[PDB]
Write a protein that binds this ligand. Sequence first.
Ligand SMILES: CC(=O)N[C@H]1[C@@H](O[C@H]2[C@@H](O)[C@@H](CO)O[C@@H](O[C@H]3[C@H](O)[C@@H](O)[C@H](O)O[C@@H]3CO)[C@@H]2O[C@@H]2O[C@@H](C)[C@@H](O)[C@@H](O)[C@@H]2O)O[C@H](CO)[C@H](O)[C@@H]1O
Ligand SMILES: CC(=O)N[C@H]1[C@@H](O[C@H]2[C@@H](O)[C@@H](CO)O[C@@H](O[C@H]3[C@H](O)[C@@H](O)[C@H](O)O[C@@H]3CO)[C@@H]2O[C@@H]2O[C@@H](C)[C@@H](O)[C@@H](O)[C@@H]2O)O[C@H](CO)[C@H](O)[C@@H]1O
Ligand SMILES: CC(=O)N[C@H]1[C@@H](O[C@H]2[C@@H](O)[C@@H](CO)O[C@@H](O[C@H]3[C@H](O)[C@@H](O)[C@H](O)O[C@@H]3CO)[C@@H]2O[C@@H]2O[C@@H](C)[C@@H](O)[C@@H](O)[C@@H]2O)O[C@H](CO)[C@H](O)[C@@H]1O
Ligand SMILES: CC(=O)N[C@H]1[C@@H](O[C@H]2[C@@H](O)[C@@H](CO)O[C@@H](O[C@H]3[C@H](O)[C@@H](O)[C@H](O)O[C@@H]3CO)[C@@H]2O[C@@H]2O[C@@H](C)[C@@H](O)[C@@H](O)[C@@H]2O)O[C@H](CO)[C@H](O)[C@@H]1O
Lengths: 150, 150, 150, 150
Amino acid sequence: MLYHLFVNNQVKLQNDFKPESVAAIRSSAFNSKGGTTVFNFLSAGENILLHISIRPGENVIVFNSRLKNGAWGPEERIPYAEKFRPPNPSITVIDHGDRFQIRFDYGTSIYYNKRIKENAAAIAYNAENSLFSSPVTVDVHGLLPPLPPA
Amino acid sequence: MLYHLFVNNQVKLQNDFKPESVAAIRSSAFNSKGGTTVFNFLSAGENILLHISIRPGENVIVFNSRLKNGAWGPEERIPYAEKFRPPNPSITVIDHGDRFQIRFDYGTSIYYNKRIKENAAAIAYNAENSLFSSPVTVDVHGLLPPLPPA
Amino acid sequence: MLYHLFVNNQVKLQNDFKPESVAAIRSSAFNSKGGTTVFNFLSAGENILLHISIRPGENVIVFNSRLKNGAWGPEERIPYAEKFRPPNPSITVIDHGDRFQIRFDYGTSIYYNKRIKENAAAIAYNAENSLFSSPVTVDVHGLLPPLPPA
Amino acid sequence: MLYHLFVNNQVKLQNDFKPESVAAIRSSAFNSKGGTTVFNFLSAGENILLHISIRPGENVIVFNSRLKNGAWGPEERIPYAEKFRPPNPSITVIDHGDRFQIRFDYGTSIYYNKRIKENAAAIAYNAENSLFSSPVTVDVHGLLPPLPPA
Ligand SMILES: CC(=O)N[C@H]1[C@@H](O[C@H]2[C@@H](O)[C@@H](CO)O[C@@H](O[C@H]3[C@H](O)[C@@H](O)[C@H](O)O[C@@H]3CO)[C@@H]2O[C@@H]2O[C@@H](C)[C@@H](O)[C@@H](O)[C@@H]2O)O[C@H](CO)[C@H](O)[C@@H]1O
Ligand SMILES: CC(=O)N[C@H]1[C@@H](O[C@H]2[C@@H](O)[C@@H](CO)O[C@@H](O[C@H]3[C@H](O)[C@@H](O)[C@H](O)O[C@@H]3CO)[C@@H]2O[C@@H]2O[C@@H](C)[C@@H](O)[C@@H](O)[C@@H]2O)O[C@H](CO)[C@H](O)[C@@H]1O
Ligand SMILES: CC(=O)N[C@H]1[C@@H](O[C@H]2[C@@H](O)[C@@H](CO)O[C@@H](O[C@H]3[C@H](O)[C@@H](O)[C@H](O)O[C@@H]3CO)[C@@H]2O[C@@H]2O[C@@H](C)[C@@H](O)[C@@H](O)[C@@H]2O)O[C@H](CO)[C@H](O)[C@@H]1O
Ligand SMILES: CC(=O)N[C@H]1[C@@H](O[C@H]2[C@@H](O)[C@@H](CO)O[C@@H](O[C@H]3[C@H](O)[C@@H](O)[C@H](O)O[C@@H]3CO)[C@@H]2O[C@@H]2O[C@@H](C)[C@@H](O)[C@@H](O)[C@@H]2O)O[C@H](CO)[C@H](O)[C@@H]1O
């Protein structure tokens, strides 16, 4: 399922993002002088199951979760440097039931254990000066599709 | 190369759309009550090398070419009915040197012999009430990439 | 990297099968009257890191591990029915660092926690009357490749 | 549809190879000291619709056709060098109705106009000391499948 997620907006998924689901996010650009850029996977109750905060200024990418009107939990971080590949950087999120797997363009995957047991009904995108294009292309799979040789 | 082509706009290709090039256009929607929708491949001189006019009202898809300030040549047509697949219809254009190959979601390909010998520097998208989403996702390949099993 | 793995034989991998690695096994056939068919991921020292025993007669698929000539550990099994899709059934294995994700044609993925801290140097295929073809096509990725829209 | 085509043998296709059809041939190896390696697309009556003779010693790749026990027609050749990429070289053939498009790992496509109005029922592979592996992996599509972004 193809979606066009605009900056400071969200897309309501036709089907819940649940175990086995795959979300491939791709940008048509990389604004080197962009600021903090966020992607959230929200439950129907608007809980933030997965919060991805890309902070080039802090040279870090932050992961977290929180209830609609609840506090954040302890953050999980990794260096921002050399993770994305210009000019079409991407982010891939896979739901493995008990945890999310996040892959950027380079390096090893990031594994984030779930903290809220619900599926996502929407994906939101936030930024004052996005590191990426608006909108971003988002292909959501109900399962991993057949792979090409390379 | 990923591009986001907005309705009534165009995208300047980083590389010329020439022989071997592949353009996969995908929409995140299908507005059943949409009107005539056009896609043009333009040379740097703004010549319309390939004109694709989707006319649901006329139940036809028209192909043509013309110089920046020149007249159209004789049209090439095919029925519009059962060509696209909702909700994410697509159009694929491949440059085979002496002719373009156009594939929609269903049916056989359409072959349009070239009438202007130039490569394309841009792709334009026109519609008052687009049949597709705005923008549309466009992946341009310099050559056919490795294929998946299915 | 493409390999052709013959029944009762094995392929020596060019690079170690480790975290991020993906093995897409595909058969050119499905022999209905076939018997127990096995696939093993072996370490350099020949430890069976991951054992997949497909048993049609017992209607189960058994997952296990064991050192070279050691004792098998507790078996992790699932029902065999409605897992493979003919005529080209497939098996996809992904190394996630602390566990393996195994995917068949139907159903949800299977997760098998690692038990031996070593990477796989080879993949073996055993069967007296294989459920699949000989050889089977095997594409091994060092990391998940770009995905098609569908 | 996946097939395993062995050297000096052939695969009988499930469906005819006709317009829109795509055959992605891939080898799990590249034998440098190999000799003339051939691939033929045969009609039901065994006419050689498309003959691809890869000759390293003559530094050319020869394209031709001929009825079952008939005379070969004029040869269409190109240089052999810098066409295949080891260790997994490939050959992709697409039927475009009035001609075939042949793609190797490097260079531009080769276009071969049809000479015998019949579809192919089988694909044969001949070689005394093959440049490729035995078998070679062959995925045949009834039409171009969705493409990955890269
Ligand atoms: C920033 C955005 O677009 N989304 C929200 C969101 O922002 C906060 C989350 O990203 C959160 C993830 O754990 O981190 C917060 O920053 C924390 C620092 O990482 C931490 O070192 C420090 O101890 O505490 C701060 C604040 O909790 C994000 O907060 C925002 O950015 C920071 C730099 C600061 O400017 C703060 O005032 C901002 O709120 O969530 C907040 C509300 O929690 C807003 O809704 C953002 O728009
Ligand atoms: C419509 C659009 O978005 N692009 C341009 C473009 O429109 C014309 C082309 O699509 C052209 C392709 O051959 O067909 C024209 O319609 C022709 C009919 O197909 C044909 O049966 C009849 O004999 O002649 C007409 C006009 O040449 C398209 O013309 C437009 O749509 C038609 C239905 C009519 O409303 C006409 O007034 C419109 O111009 O090119 C034109 C200029 O040539 C405009 O720039 C459109 O915006
Ligand atoms: C074809 C192949 O590679 N088989 C090997 C392999 O077979 C054993 C493993 O698959 C092992 C994994 O847990 O299971 C063994 O069967 C067990 C049954 O699952 C369990 O219900 C029963 O209580 O105990 C047995 C023994 O541990 C497999 O053993 C072979 O198949 C079973 C069905 C039985 O016929 C037994 O006699 C066989 O040994 O590993 C063995 C060595 O352990 C051989 O190398 C097989 O060729
Ligand atoms: C391995 C294989 O499948 N080869 C077949 C096949 O070989 C002939 C075709 O490849 C044919 C395609 O045009 O070319 C023939 O060679 C020609 C040379 O290209 C041309 O320069 C020369 O002047 O004339 C020859 C003959 O037509 C292929 O013929 C075989 O290989 C050549 C190099 C030579 O050694 C000749 O004696 C061989 O027959 O088809 C033949 C039957 O025509 C056999 O079935 C091969 O096994």
